[PDB]
Design a protein around this ligand. Structure first.
Ligand SMILES: Nc1ncnc2c1ncn2[C@@H]1O[C@H](COP(=O)(O)OP(=O)(O)OP(=O)(O)O)[C@@H](O)[C@H]1O
Ligand SMILES: Nc1ncnc2c1ncn2[C@@H]1O[C@H](COP(=O)(O)OP(=O)(O)OP(=O)(O)O)[C@@H](O)[C@H]1O
Ligand SMILES: Nc1ncnc2c1ncn2[C@@H]1O[C@H](COP(=O)(O)OP(=O)(O)OP(=O)(O)O)[C@@H](O)[C@H]1O
Ligand SMILES: [Ca+2]
Ligand SMILES: [Zn+2]
Ligand SMILES: [Zn+2]
Ligand SMILES: [Zn+2]
Lengths: 204, 228, 162, 122
């Protein structure tokens, strides 16, 4: 199916528009096993990553609710038209702003809100809001999305080590360890080649 | 009574092993250790003990036996060398040359960084006095000359103490380039902290062991950037 | 005052590779800041979020997950090597466990009987002695050394255990 | 209104160490933004990308991978030590599995016979 899709993309590029040969570069993931292993680390626990993203979206939704109810006058966004607009006139806009401009920042949504003045009555509220966003949705959740990948890497490495040592140590048919064939007339390197040759069983 | 002094001398030159006869029975061969067995350097022993790699089975002997001949050649070379007094004196002091060369490189780089719009404390004081009296340029020239001579001595010791040699000759090339071509070429000499340190080399190994994985991930990032 | 990057696909690639990867939020940080009353605003939002979530959280974090995994692999393999070196015998590959309650402890099995340097000395002796004066075992081991055989070494069996 | 850093090599080092390491995109975020028609534009692109990819994705990530690896090493060592403490006897170093189906179990072989405090008392 992948190869016929490749043919389809090639013919589209040849006839429809030359800007379809780009997708062909996604043969590097197929021609290579190392890159495929990295993408496997990404996409083995894919449900974990997607559910963590949904958790981040839920937290963004709650923070957007709080901002819309209380801090809706601090959601002011610079714009370049063809001077400064207001984001929070509707909870959907608050969610969009806090998900686009709040996740894509090193300090959370507090980097886009109106910069407060120390002599305001909402200053402690803004400080707590920004710090909570930064500590819950940018140091933990967006870091869980990466800790999951790291843990998946470790799991793949351990699984591959187990499989390889099983293959190179124990017999394929009888599952008999290598050490059992020490100080014996037949060595394990011979037991697997003449007696328990798994291809002789297929021939039989 | 045979316990230990002639007896101590004989027990110091009498080695026993447990070869396995053809009939699957073991023997205990006791033999005098040849003379050249007193020249095997301790560093070589440590290297062969640590770096030797297990073969397909749990057997490290298939490589030790292979290295036996090279060890014998080194044994003979050490016997020959110990007669030569000057080269042997150099060879005994091999870490000293490396330390001196690295310290000179670091001091040259510090002097360049701090001045270039255009017993360690005692050595620092000596360099400061040289800077005060002669000034930068001559101090730099003499420091580079000392570095080059010390690295030549280090390389002759290295060969006499026989890819790493390629690195050392590259270091020589960089030193001479800095001394003559342009004084900003000593910057590359600071890439000896990797060779002089095992920990930094271990982190660099963590980086460059799966280098193909990193490069292919970078190419994937480039493909995604291309699509976007 | 200000220039246009995308007048050619090469310039777009250069801008999105230089100013896109080198940012905490992706190419959405350099692109003209849109106005909510535009017809492409959802497209820009999706574009920026996709870049951020694919090329700056999953593809610029694999270049680092790989490094971490390599660190773990190096530690594991070094631990295996060190355990093998410090527990099992170099020549016969016999564990330290088998030499408990025996007359000779493992600290002697490696220092007197199965000293690999004694085997090296024996090899040197066998290749430094004239062929006529070889005793039985010496001529035997010379014969095997000529045959490129490695059986004469002990293998998973010391002699102090029997 | 704007000062120059690179009038000397020391000032360049200070600028690229203070303003380069402390940015999410390397020194390219402080350098003058170049016009596409300049002759050195490819040079600036390569310079910035190399700084970002060598000194901010690898080295400043090695400084953290080392910490992670040390965490793993500590956890493994502590698990080993705790398991040895809770399984094998302190004095004889005899596993717990050896005292199964025996007239006396490990739970008291370490409390009556091989009590190390009894050895200290002796
Ligand atoms: N039961 C087994 N356990 C482990 N390895 C096995 C087993 N059966 C076969 N093998 C391995 O699978 C491969 C099968 O080799 P095969 O019998 O086809 O011999 P061949 O084609 O002459 O090649 P070779 O030179 O590798 O022996 C060999 O690597 C053999 O060691
Ligand atoms: N088969 C082996 N298994 C384990 N360790 C070994 C083996 N062969 C040699 N060694 C170790 O390698 C080193 C070689 O010992 P060597 O004959 O050089 O002793 P030495 O120079 O007198 O020093 P020392 O006995 O104080 O370590 C020692 O550490 C010895 O324990
Ligand atoms: N060789 C050993 N192996 C394992 N655990 C040991 C060993 N020797 C002592 N311990 C443990 O150390 C502690 C020493 O117990 P101790 O003789 O002091 O009794 P205690 O202070 O009256 O306490 P308790 O009987 O309630 O455990 C106990 O936990 C004992 O299980
Ligand atoms: Ca004879
Ligand atoms: Zn079998
Ligand atoms: Zn042994
Ligand atoms: Zn006990």
């Amino acid at each position: 199916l992948y190869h016929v899709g490749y043919i389809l993309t090639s013919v589209l590029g040849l006839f429809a528009h030359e800007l379809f040969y780009s997708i062909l570069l996604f043969d590097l993931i197929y021609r290579e096993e190392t890159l495929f292993n990295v993408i496997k680390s990404v996409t083995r626990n894919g449900r974990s990553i997607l559910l963590t993203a949904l958790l981040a979206l839920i937290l963004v939704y709650l923070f957007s609710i709080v901002g819309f109810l209380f801090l809706k006058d601090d959601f002011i966004l610079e714009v370049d038209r063809l001077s400064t607009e207001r984001a929070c006139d509707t909870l959907l806009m608050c969610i969009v702003t806090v998900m686009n401009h709040g996740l894509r920042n090193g300090g959370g949504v507090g980097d886009i809100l109106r910069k407060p003045s120390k002599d305001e009555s909402l200053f402690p509220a803004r400080v707590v809001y920004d710090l909570l966003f930064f500590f819950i949705v940018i140091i933990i959740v967006l870091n869980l999305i990466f800790g999951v990948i790291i843990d998946t890497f470790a799991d793949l490495r351990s699984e591959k080590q187990k499989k390889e040592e099983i293959l190179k140590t124990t017999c394929f048919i009888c599952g008999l360890e290598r050490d059992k064939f020490d100080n014996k007339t037949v060595s394990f390197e011979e037991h697997i080649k003449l007696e328990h040759n798994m291809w002789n069983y297929l021939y039989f | 009574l045979l316990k230990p002094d002639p007896l101590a001398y004989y027990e110091n030159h009498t080695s026993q092993i447990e070869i396995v006869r053809q009939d699957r029975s073991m023997e205990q061969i006791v033999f005098p250790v040849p003379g050249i067995c007193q020249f095997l350097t301790e560093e070589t022993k440590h290297r062969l003990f640590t770096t030797t790699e297990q073969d397909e089975q749990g057997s490290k002997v298939s490589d030790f036996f292979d290295q036996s001949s090279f060890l014998h050649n080194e044994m003979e070379w050490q016997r020959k060398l110990r007669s030569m007094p000057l080269i042997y004196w150099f060879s005994r002091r091999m870490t000293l040359w490396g330390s001196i060369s690295f310290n000179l490189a670091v001091f040259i780089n510090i002097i360049i960084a701090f001045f270039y719009p255009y017993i360690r404390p005692l050595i620092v004081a000596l360099i400061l006095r040289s800077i005060y009296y002669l000034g930068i340029g001559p101090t730099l020239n003499i420091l580079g000359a000392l570095n080059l001579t010390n690295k030549i001595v280090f390389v002759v010791s290295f060969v006499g103490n026989r890819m790493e040699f390629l690195y050392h000759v590259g270091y020589i090339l960089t030193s001479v380039l800095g001394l003559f071509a342009h004084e900003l070429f000593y910057s590359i000499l600071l890439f000896d902290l990797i060779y002089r340190e095992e920990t930094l080399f271990n982190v660099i190994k963590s980086v460059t062991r799966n280098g193909r994985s990193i490069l292919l991930t970078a190419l994937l990032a480039l493909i995604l950037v291309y699509l976007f | 005052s200000t220039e246009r990057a995308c007048d050619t696909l090469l310039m777009c690639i250069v801008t999105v590779m230089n100013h896109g990867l080198r940012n905490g939020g992706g190419v959405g940080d350099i692109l003209r800041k849109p106005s909510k009353d535009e017809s492409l605003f959802p497209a820009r939002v999706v574009y920026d979020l996709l870049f951020f979530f694919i090329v700056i959280i999953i593809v610029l974090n694999l270049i680092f997950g790989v490094i971490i995994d390599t660190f773990a692999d190096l530690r594991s393999e070094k631990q295996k090597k060190e355990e093998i070196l410090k527990t099992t015998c170099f020549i016969c590959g016999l564990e330290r466990d088998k030499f408990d309650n025996k007359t000779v402890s493992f600290e002697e099995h490696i220092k007197l009987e199965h000293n690999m340097w004694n085997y090296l000395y024996f090899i040197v002796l066998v290749r430094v002695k004239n062929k006529t004066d070889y005793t039985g075992p010496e001529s035997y081991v010379a014969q095997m050394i000529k045959n490129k055989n490695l059986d004469w070494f002990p293998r998973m069996r010391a002699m102090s255990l029997v």
